C-alpha cells in the first residue's frame, strides 16, 4: 500500500516530579504551642 | 448583463450558469424587462408621486 | 525537624487536581463495566 | 466557627486574633487558595511588624502558585530578611528551607543560580533528597541523560524514597534505549516499589500500565491466542489504571491510558469523550495531538485539522515536522473524501514546508504521492470544474513527482521498495501524463468556444442597434 | 454528536435593565476572532468577569411532548452545568470568512461570530447550548 507516510504514537508520558517549595507549619500547628495558647488565663 | 461575467447572475445560485453567458436572445428579453422597469420608474417619479413618497 | 516543619500544599495523588479538580467517577464506572466486565 | 468569631469581633470592635486567620488559611489550602491567601494577607496586615518567617514563606508560595512571580519574589526576599530574627535552634532548618525555595524560584527564572544554590545546600545538608533530585534532574536536562551513574547512586542512597524512585523511573523511561538497559528492569523496579513500599502509589502503577501497553502493542498478532495475550496485557494495564482511579478518580493520566487502550480496541467514542474531558481539564501538546488522532479515527477531518493547528501554534510553535505531517495527512483525507482541490493544495504546501525544514525521503515520497493524487483528481474533474492553470500545475507536479520517484528508487533504503517506486513512476508517465494533455486540449477547446460565443454576440448586438 | 466546542473567557458582564439576565461577551482562547454574546440566567448560572467557560453546541442530547427526565436515563446534559434549547433564526453567510449565527433561547439571545470552517455545521433549525464551569 504505497500511500502517505505517517506515524501515530499517543503521548501519555508522565512529567518529572515537580518538587515544589514546601510550606512552613505555623507555631500554632504544633501541639505544645496549642496547649499553651488555649490554657491562657 | 449576460455578456460581462462579473456583472451577471452568480453561478452558485443557478444550475444552468454554464450555458447562459453569450446568449443574445435571452439578453434581448432581459433588456426588454429592464426597459419596462425604467419606464415604470419614470412614470412613478415624474407623474404620480413627484415628491418621491414610496409607501402607499 | 525539617520534615516536621515541612508542609506540601498538594498531595501526591491530588497533584493532578491543583486549583481545579474534575471527577471521572463515571469514566471509572464505564471502564469497570466495559473493560474488567468486557465480554 | 472561625467566621462567626470574626464577625462577632468585628461587631464588638475587638482585635481579631490572626491565629484564626492562619487556621482558616490552613483549612482553605485544600479548598480555596484564593480565600486562604486573602486570610493570610489579613493576618499579615493585623500583625504589621509582627510578621513571621512562616507567614512570608506561605505568602510567597501562594503567589508562586498564582504565578505572581514579582510578588512571590518580594515575599521570599522579606522572608530571607526576617530570617536574621529567627531563633538559633530553628535557624539552620529555616535557612535551608528558604534557600531551597529561592533555588526553586531561580530554577523557574534562571537554572544557573538554582544549581549554584543547590550545590550550596547539598554541601550544607547532603541528606536532603529534593535538592539532590532537582540538581541531578537539571544536570540530566543539560547532559541529555548522560549521568545515569548519578541517578543510580541517588536511587541507592534512598531506596525507600518515593520521590527518588519516581525520578529514577522517569529517567529510565526517558533514556532506557539510550543506556541499553533491560526493558523489564524498570518494570521490576516498580513492582518492588509497589509490593514492598507502597501498593497505592499511582506513579508506579501508571508506569507499569504504560510498559504493559507498550509490550502489548509491540506484540505481533497471528491468531486468537496472541490477540488474547495482548488483551490480557491491556487488561493488566487497565487494572493498574482502575486501581489508580480507586485511589484517586481525578487522575487525567489514567483516563488517557484508558482512552489509548480503547483506541487500540477501536472504542473510538469513549476515547473521544475522555480526550475532550482531558482537554477541558488540562491543555498540553499531547492532549491536542491525541484529539487530532481521535478525530482522524472519527472521520472528523476538519476538527482534526483544527486540533493539529492549535497543537502546532501553542506548544511546538511551528517547528516539529510530525505535526506538519499530521496536518498534511488530515488535509489529504479531507480532499479525498470531500473531493476538494483546495485541501490538496494546502496539503501540498504543508508537505513542501515540512520537507524544506527536513529534506527527508519520507517527505519526498509524501510530496510525490500528493502530486500524483492531485493529477489524478484534476484529470477526473470535468472541464467546467477546472481551468488551464490547474492543469498546468498538475502536469508540472506530475513531472517533478516522477523525477523524485526515480530519485527515491535510487536511494539505499527508500520508504517503499524501489521496484514499487519505479513501477508507480512508469504507470504515471505512461497513461496519466497523456490524459493530462488530453484534458488540457479539451479545456483549451472549451475556452475557445466560450470566447467565440462572447465575440459573436457583441457584433450582432451592434448590428441591431 | 456535538456540533461545536470551545473554551471562552468572559470579557464583559452586563446586567443593565434586568435582574435575572446578564449579557456576557467571550472570545475563544484557542482561536481569536471567535466571539460569543449570550444571555444567561444569573440566579441559576452566575458568572463573573474573566471566568473560563466550556461552551458546546449540539443538535441533540442523545448518546415530541416534553416530560420531566427520569433519574434512570442518561443524556449528554449530565456533564454540564447549564443547558438551554433554542431556535436558529439567522445564519449570516457574510464576508469571506465572517459567519454570524443568531440563536434565540425563548427570548434569550445568542450571537456567535467565527470563521466558516468552525461554524459550517451550525446550519440547523434548533440547537442546544451546553455550558460548563
Residue E10 falls in which region: left (phi positive, over 0), alpha (psi -120 to 50) or beta = beta
- Are D216 and D257 a contacting pair, CB within 8 Å? no
**Grid cell for residue E70:** 427520569
- Output the CA–CA distances (angstroms, integers) from residue D147 to A15, D158, D172, D298, in the order listed: 19, 17, 12, 43
Backbone angles phi, psi at E113, to 5 degrees: -95, 140
**DSSP H or E stretch at residue A33:** helix A31-38
Name chain D contacts of C1, Cβ cutoff 8 Å: 90, 93
Measured between CB atoms, which of D384, D450, D460 is closest to B24? Answer: D460
- Are D33 and D62 a contacting pair, CB within 8 Å? yes
Q: How crowded is the C-beta side of E44, counted as CA atoms within 13 Å?
A: 11
Sign of the Cα torsion D307, D308, D311, D314 reads negative
Give first-to-last CA distance, chain E, whole Å.
20
Kindly report the CATH class assigned to E1-133: mainly beta
Tell which of A12, A14, A22 to mutate to test the C interface (max C CBs under 10 Å).
A22
Distance in angstroms (rounded) separating the CA atoms of residues D455 and D277: 63
Name chain D contacts of E79, Cβ cutoff 8 Å: 277
Cβ-defined contact of D249 to C25 (cutoff 8 Å): yes
Measured between CB atoms, which of C13, C19, C28 is closest to D242? Answer: C28
**Grid cell for residue E52:** 473560563
Residue in the structure block whose three cell numbers are 530578611: D81
Cβ-defined contact of C2 to D96 (cutoff 8 Å): yes
Neighbours of D214 (CB within 10 A): 13
Distance in angstroms (rounded) separating the CA atoms of residues D43 and D243: 42
CB contact B8 to D (< 8 Å): no
Distance in angstroms (rounded) separating the CA atoms of residues D160 and D146: 24
Among residues E45, B8, C32, C19, the alpha carbon closest in space to that of D270 is found at C32
**Residue C21 DSSP label:** -
What does E103-126 look like in DSSP terms, one character per residue? EEETTEEEEEEE-HHHHGGG--SE
Name chain A contacts of C4, Cβ cutoff 8 Å: 25
What secondary structure, in 3-state letters, does chain D show?
CHHHHHHHHHHHCCCCCHHHHHHHHHHHCCCCHHHHHHHHHHHHHHHHHHCCHHHHHHHHHHHHHCCCHHHHHHHHHHHHHHHHHCCHHHHHHHHHHHHHHHHHHHHHHCHHHHHHHHHHHHHHCCCCHHHHHHHHHHHHHHHCCCCHHHHHHHHHHCCCCHHHHHHHHHHHHHHHHHHCCCCCHHHHHHHHHHHHHCCCCHHHHHHHHHHHHHHHHHCCCCCHHHHHHHHHHHHHHHHHHHHHHHHCCCCHHHHHHHHHHHHHCCCHHHHHHHHHHHHHHCCCHHHHHHHHHHHHHCCCHHHHHHHHHHHHHHHHCCCCHHHHHHHHHHHHHHHHHHCCHHHHHHHHHHHHHHHHHHCCHHHHHHHHHHHHHHHHHHHHCCHHHCCHHHHHHHHHHHHHHHHHHHHHHCCCCCCCCHHHHHHHHHHHHHHHHHHHHHHHHHHHHHHHHHHHHHHHHHHHHHHHC
Among residues A9, C26, C23, A17, the alpha carbon closest in space to that of D210 is found at A9
Q: How many CB pairs under 8 A join B and D?
A: 18
Distance in angstroms (rounded) separating the CA atoms of residues D409 and D401: 12
**All residues at 6 or more sequence positions from E26 whose CB lies less than 8 Å from its CB, including other chains:** E8, E9, E10, E11, E35, E36, E38, E53, E55
Distance in angstroms (rounded) separating the CA atoms of residues E76 and E82: 12
Distance in angstroms (rounded) separating the CA atoms of residues C6 and D94: 10
Q: How far is D454 from chain B (nearest CA, A)?
A: 5
Tell which of E30, E96, E132 to mutate to test the D interface (max D CBs under 10 Å).
E30
Cβ-defined contact of D280 to E31 (cutoff 8 Å): no
Buried b (16+ CB within 10 A) or exposed e, D407-445: ebbeeeebbbebebbbebbeebeeebeeebeebbeebee
Name chain D contacts of E54, Cβ cutoff 8 Å: 280
Distance in angstroms (rounded) separating the CA atoms of residues D306 and D292: 8
Cβ-defined contact of B21 to D460 (cutoff 8 Å): no
Backbone angles phi, psi at E4, to 5 degrees: -160, 145
C-beta contacts of D165-173 below 8 A and 24+ residues apart: D165/D189, D165/D193, D165/D197, D165/D204, D166/A17, D166/D203, D166/D204, D167/A16, D167/A17, D167/D133, D167/D136, D167/D137, D169/D203, D169/D204, D169/D207, D170/A14, D170/A16, D170/A17, D171/D140, D171/D145, D173/A13, D173/A14, D173/D207, D173/D210
Query: What does the radius of gyration of chain B's CA atoms come to, in whole angstroms?
Result: 16
Cβ-defined contact of D281 to C22 (cutoff 8 Å): yes
- Are D367 and D352 a contacting pair, CB within 8 Å? yes
Neighbours of B55 (CB within 10 A): 3
Name chain E contacts of D310, Cβ cutoff 8 Å: 30-31
Distance in angstroms (rounded) separating the CA atoms of residues A5 and A2: 9
Among residues B15, B12, B32, the alpha carbon closest in space to that of B24 is found at B32
Cβ-defined contact of D202 to C12 (cutoff 8 Å): yes
User: Angle D418-427/D388-409 helices, nearest 10 degrees?
Assistant: 150
- Are E115 and E44 a contacting pair, CB within 8 Å? no
CB contact A22 to C (< 8 Å): yes
Tell me the technique behind this structure: cryo-EM
Strand, coil or helix: what is B30? helix
Amino acid at each position: 500500500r504505497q500511500d502517505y507516510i505517517a506515524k501515530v504514537r499517543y503521548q501519555n508520558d508522565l512529567p518529572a516530579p515537580p518538587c515544589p517549595p514546601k510550606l512552613l507549619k505555623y507555631e500554632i500547628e504544633k501541639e505544645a504551642p496549642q496547649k499553651e495558647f488555649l490554657k491562657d488565663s | 448583463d449576460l455578456m460581462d461575467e462579473k456583472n451577471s447572475i452568480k453561478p452558485d445560485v443557478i444550475e444552468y450558469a454554464a450555458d447562459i453567458l453569450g446568449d443574445v436572445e435571452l439578453q434581448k428579453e432581459l433588456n426588454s424587462e429592464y426597459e419596462q422597469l425604467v419606464s415604470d420608474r419614470k412614470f412613478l417619479r415624474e407623474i404620480v408621486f413627484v415628491n418621491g413618497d414610496h409607501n402607499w | 525537624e525539617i520534615a516536621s516543619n515541612e508542609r506540601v500544599l498538594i498531595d501526591h495523588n491530588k497533584v493532578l487536581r491543583g486549583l481545579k479538580p474534575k471527577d471521572f467517577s463515571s469514566v471509572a464506572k464505564d471502564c469497570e463495566l466495559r473493560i474488567l466486565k468486557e465480554k | 466557627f472561625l467566621e462567626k468569631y470574626v464577625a462577632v469581633c468585628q461587631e464588638e470592635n475587638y482585635p481579631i486574633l490572626p491565629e484564626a486567620y492562619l487556621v482558616l488559611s490552613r483549612v482553605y489550602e485544600n479548598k480555596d487558595l484564593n480565600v486562604a491567601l486573602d486570610y493570610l494577607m489579613k493576618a499579615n496586615d493585623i500583625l504589621g511588624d509582627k510578621a513571621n518567617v512562616y507567614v512570608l514563606n506561605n505568602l510567597g508560595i501562594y503567589h508562586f502558585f498564582r504565578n505572581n512571580v514579582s510578588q512571590s519574589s518580594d515575599f521570599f526576599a522579606q522572608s530571607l530578611e526576617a530570617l536574621n530574627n529567627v531563633s538559633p535552634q530553628n535557624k539552620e532548618a529555616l535557612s535551608i528551607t528558604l534557600h531551597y525555595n529561592k533555588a526553586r524560584v531561580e530554577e523557574v527564572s534562571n537554572q544557573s543560580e538554582a544549581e549554584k544554590l543547590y550545590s550550596k545546600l547539598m554541601e550544607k545538608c547532603p541528606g536532603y533528597t529534593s535538592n539532590k533530585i532537582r540538581y541531578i534532574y537539571l544536570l540530566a536536562l543539560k547532559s541529555n541523560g548522560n549521568n545515569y551513574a548519578d541517578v543510580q547512586q541517588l536511587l541507592d542512597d534512598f531506596p525507600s524514597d518515593l520521590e527518588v524512585r519516581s525520578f529514577y523511573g522517569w529517567f529510565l523511561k526517558r533514556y532506557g534505549r539510550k543506556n541499553g538497559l533491560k526493558q523489564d528492569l524498570e518494570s521490576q523496579h516498580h513492582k518492588d516499589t509497589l509490593i514492598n513500599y507502597d501498593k497505592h502509589d499511582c506513579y508506579a502503577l501508571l508506569s507499569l500500565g504504560n510498559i504493559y501497553a507498550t509490550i502489548a502493542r509491540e506484540m505481533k498478532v497471528t491468531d486468537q491466542k496472541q490477540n488474547e495475550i495482548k488483551r490480557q496485557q491491556y487488561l493488566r494495564a487497565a487494572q493498574f489504571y482502575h486501581k489508580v482511579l480507586s485511589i484517586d478518580p481525578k487522575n487525567i493520566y489514567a483516563a488517557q491510558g484508558i482512552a489509548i487502550i480503547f483506541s487500540d480496541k477501536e472504542r473510538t467514542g469513549l476515547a473521544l469523550e475522555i480526550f475532550k474531558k482531558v482537554r477541558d481539564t488540562v491543555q498540553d501538546l499531547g492532549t491536542f495531538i491525541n484529539l487530532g488522532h481521535c478525530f482522524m479515527e472519527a472521520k472528523q477531518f476538519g476538527k482534526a485539522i483544527e486540533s493539529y493547528t492549535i497543537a502546532l501554534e501553542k506548544f511546538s510553535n511551528g517547528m516539529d515536522s510530525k505535526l506538519l505531517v499530521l496536518i498534511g495527512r488530515a488535509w489529504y483525507h479531507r480532499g479525498f473524501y470531500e473531493k476538494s482541490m483546495d485541501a490538496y493544495k494546502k496539503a501540498l504546501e504543508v508537505s513542501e514546508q515540512a520537507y524544506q525544514l527536513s529534506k527527508l525521503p519520507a517527505l519526498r515520497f509524501n510530496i510525490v504521492f500528493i502530486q500524483f493524487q492531485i493529477a489524478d483528481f484534476v484529470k477526473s474533474l470535468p472541464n467546467t470544474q477546472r481551468d488551464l492553470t490547474t492543469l498546468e500545475n498538475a502536469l508540472s507536479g506530475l513531472n517533478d513527482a516522477i523525477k523524485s520517484l526515480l530519485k527515491l528508487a535510487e536511494l539505499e533504503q527508500p520508504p517503499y521498495p524501489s521496484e514499487d517506486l519505479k513501477a508507480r513512476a512508469t504507470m504515471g508517465s505512461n497513461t496519466l501524463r497523456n490524459q493530462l494533455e488530453r484534458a488540457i486540449q479539451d479545456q483549451q477547446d472549451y475556452e475557445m468556444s466560450i470566447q467565440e460565443k462572447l465575440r459573436t454576440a457583441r457584433r450582432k448586438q451592434q448590428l441591431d442597434e | 454528536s456535538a456540533l461545536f466546542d470551545d473554551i471562552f473567557t468572559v470579557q464583559t458582564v452586563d446586567n443593565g435593565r434586568y435582574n435575572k439576565v446578564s449579557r456576557i461577551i467571550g472570545i475563544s482562547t484557542t482561536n481569536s476572532a471567535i466571539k460569543l454574546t449570550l444571555d444567561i440566567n444569573n440566579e441559576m448560572f452566575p458568572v463573573s468577569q474573566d471566568d473560563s467557560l466550556t461552551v458546546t453546541l449540539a443538535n441533540s442530547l442523545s448518546l415530541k411532548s416534553w416530560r420531566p427526565p427520569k433519574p434512570t436515563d442518561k443524556s449528554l446534559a449530565d456533564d454540564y452545568d447549564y443547558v438551554m434549547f433554542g431556535t436558529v433564526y439567522k445564519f449570516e453567510e457574510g464576508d469571506e470568512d465572517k459567519i454570524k449565527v443568531y440563536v434565540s433561547f425563548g427570548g434569550l439571545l445568542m450571537c456567535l461570530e467565527g470563521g466558516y470552517k468552525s461554524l459550517a455545521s451550525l446550519k440547523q433549525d434548533n440547537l442546544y447550548i451546553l455550558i460548563r464551569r
